[PDB]
Amino acid sequence: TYAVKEIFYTLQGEGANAGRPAVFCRFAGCNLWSGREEDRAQAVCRFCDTDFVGTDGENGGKFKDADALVATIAGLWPAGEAHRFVVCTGGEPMLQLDQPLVDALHAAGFGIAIETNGSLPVLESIDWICVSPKADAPLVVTKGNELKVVIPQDNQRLADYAKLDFEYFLVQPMDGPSRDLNTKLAIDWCKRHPQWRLSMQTHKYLNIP
Amino acid sequence: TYAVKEIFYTLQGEGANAGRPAVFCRFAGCNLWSGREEDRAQAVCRFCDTDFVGTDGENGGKFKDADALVATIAGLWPAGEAHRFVVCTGGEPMLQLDQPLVDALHAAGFGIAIETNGSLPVLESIDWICVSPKADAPLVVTKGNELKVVIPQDNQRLADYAKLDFEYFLVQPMDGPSRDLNTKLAIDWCKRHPQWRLSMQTHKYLNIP
Numbered sequence: 251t252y253a254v255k256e257i258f259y260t261l262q263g264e265g266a267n268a269g270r271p272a273v274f275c276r277f278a279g280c281n282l283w284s285g286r287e288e289d290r291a292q293a294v295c296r297f298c299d300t301d302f303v304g305t306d307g308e309n310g311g312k313f314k315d316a317d318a319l320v321a322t323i324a325g326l327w328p329a330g331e332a333h334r335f336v337v338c339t340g341g342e343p344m345l346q347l348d349q350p351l352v353d354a355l356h357a358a359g360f361g362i363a364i365e366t367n368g369s370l371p372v373l374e375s376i377d378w379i380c381v382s383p384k385a386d387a388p389l390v391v392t393k394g395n396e397l398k399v400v401i402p403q404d405n406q407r408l409a410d411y412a413k414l415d416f417e418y419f420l421v422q423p424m425d426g427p428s429r430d431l432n433t434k435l436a437i438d439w440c441k442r443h444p445q446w447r448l449s450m451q452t453h454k455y456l457n458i459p
Numbered sequence: 460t461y462a463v464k465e466i467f468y469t470l471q472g473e474g475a476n477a478g479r480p481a482v483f484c485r486f487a488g489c490n491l492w493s494g495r496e497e498d499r500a501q502a503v504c505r506f507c508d509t510d511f512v513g514t515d516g517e518n519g520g521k522f523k524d525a526d527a528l529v530a531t532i533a534g535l536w537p538a539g540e541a542h543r544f545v546v547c548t549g550g551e552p553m554l555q556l557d558q559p560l561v562d563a564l565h566a567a568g569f570g571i572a573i574e575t576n577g578s579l580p581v582l583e584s585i586d587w588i589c590v591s592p593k594a595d596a597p598l599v600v601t602k603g604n605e606l607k608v609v610i611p612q613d614n615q616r617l618a619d620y621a622k623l624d625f626e627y628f629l630v631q632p633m634d635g636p637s638r639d640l641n642t643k644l645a646i647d648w649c650k651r652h653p654q655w656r657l658s659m660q661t662h663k664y665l666n667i668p
């Protein structure tokens with residue numbers, strides 16, 4: 251059983267795969283925030299820009315098994331076209347993503363990406379692992395493909411993140427009332443510490459889902 | 460001897476390396492347009508968004524040899540930082556970029572990217588080869604890292620490009636009076652033919668050089 255907020259076909263807006271066509275599968279629920287506004291100020295992760303509460307979005311629902319979810323995912327892909335790619339997100343996808351879903355996605359020809367806060371162990375048969383550490387939460391995933399850090403956060407040891415085992419190290423400006431401010435901070439950080447690259451939320455500039 | 464319009468340190472705005480700190484070395488001159496506005500309407504490449512005429516830009520000039528050019532490029536990199544990366548552009552860089560320049564940049568710790576219109580042979584020792592084919596020019600570079608196609612151009616055979624030997628296939632919307640239209644075109648193209656990915660000119664959205 252999977253509880254999914256929404257499933258939609260678009261371009262990956264963020265990270266090293268930005269611009270790439272992908273089905274997004276947004277799981278409902280997170281382990282660092284209830285998703286309720288009354289709880290935000292007290293949450294472990296307090297800056298979230300996403301609605302992940304419930305199963306009422308586009309193609310959202312409770313899926314009885316893996317095959318059912320994969321059928322909905324595959325159905326959104328253009329007919330006759332390869333390069334199938336799904337981004338498992340949320341919410342915190344590692345609350346629900348399991349080996350049977352991964353195996354069924356692969357069997358259907360999908361490459362698999364995950365967006366995870368890094369507080370839960372990941373399945374290493376996932377093809378692309380993106381970890382986005384929250385400064386007040388534990389980080390138990392210390393290796394993957396890209397480490398995408400949202401900045402600024404209090405209590406952050408930003409330069410130390412570079413000692414972890416990732417292919418790409420990215421900073422992403424925190425969206426909110428200070429986005430242009432944070433974008434200037436993030437550009438300056440990379441230029442001073444060029445191991446790091448800038449990840450924009452391009453879908454917000456493109457105004458696409 | 461090298462004629463350089465400008466040299467500057469910023470983030471790569473385009474392609475698969477978008478977001479990455481880089482020294483841009485913009486060579487003066489192109490083989491597909493004189494760079495004069497009165498010639499634009501009759502040129503082979505007519506949509507250019509760049510000023511590549513003369514050597515009067517920031518750090519621009521005539522460099523007596525490779526060592527002199529490399530010294531200026533190296534001097535823009537943050538002191539004590541590695542991951543040195545230079546993007547050779549213009550203009551058409553393959554009018555001037557030769558083996559001794561490539562060797563000197565490599566000796567100075569630089570990885571080398573090129574932005575080329577593909578109408579001229581490129582040096583295989585270049586680390587990152589980006590080809591941007593112009594519809595009314597010969598295309599002799601048929602292998603590389605990324606093929607970044609500006610759309611729409613008349614006479615374009617877009618699907619044919621995907622048969623070439625590149626790792627990444629990107630469409631980049633043509634800036635000009637129809638940039639928003641063209642962006643929607645490019646997004647739709649990728650979603651219909653997901654071998655292709657979108658390349659935004661992010662430096663124009665971030666308002667950075």
Ligand SMILES: C[S@@+](CC[C@H](N)C(=O)[O-])C[C@H]1O[C@@H](n2cnc3c(N)ncnc32)[C@H](O)[C@@H]1O
Pocket residue numbers: 280297298299300339340341342343365366367368381382398400422423424425426451
């Ligand atoms: C909503 S999270 C879902 C996946 C998982 N919960 C995580 O945090 O990675 C998707 C991505 O957007 C980032 N994000 C969330 N809120 C953001 C904000 N206000 N500004 C910028 N990025 C944000 C997250 O850090 C993460 O990289």
Ligand SMILES: C[S@@+](CC[C@H](N)C(=O)[O-])C[C@H]1O[C@@H](n2cnc3c(N)ncnc32)[C@H](O)[C@@H]1O
Pocket residue numbers: 489506507508509548549550551552574575576577590591607609631632633634635660
């Ligand atoms: C100015 S060219 C210099 C390198 C080489 N002459 C070339 O054409 O690739 C730099 C890059 O910007 C792209 N470009 C130029 N004018 C553009 C425009 N109006 N809109 C979008 N991309 C453009 C080119 O296609 C190329 O990929």
Ligand SMILES: Nc1nc2c(c(=O)[nH]1)N[C@@H](C(=O)O)CN2
Pocket residue numbers: 260261262263264300339340365453458459
């Ligand atoms: N197009 C698009 N790409 C995204 C997001 C989103 O909401 N839209 N947000 C992030 C997510 O929710 O995983 C990552 N990339």
Ligand SMILES: Nc1nc2c(c(=O)[nH]1)N[C@@H](C(=O)O)CN2
Pocket residue numbers: 469470471472473509548549574662667668
């Ligand atoms: N930041 C930045 N990145 C760029 C460009 C540019 O002008 N600025 N234009 C392109 C170029 O001139 O080669 C490639 N990417």
Ligand code: SF4
Pocket residue numbers: 280281282283295296297298299300302340341342367384
């Ligand atoms: S961990 Fe991810 S899904 Fe949960 S609140 Fe933070 S950004 Fe949102």
Ligand code: SF4
Pocket residue numbers: 489490491492504505506507508509511549550551576593
């Ligand atoms: S080939 Fe490149 S540099 Fe020359 S006019 Fe066209 S876009 Fe500009």
Ligand SMILES: [Mg+2]
Pocket residue numbers: 299300
């Ligand atoms: Mg989101």
Ligand SMILES: [Mg+2]
Pocket residue numbers: 508509
């Ligand atoms: Mg330019």
Ligand code: NA
Pocket residue numbers: 402403404405406
């Ligand atoms: Na901080």
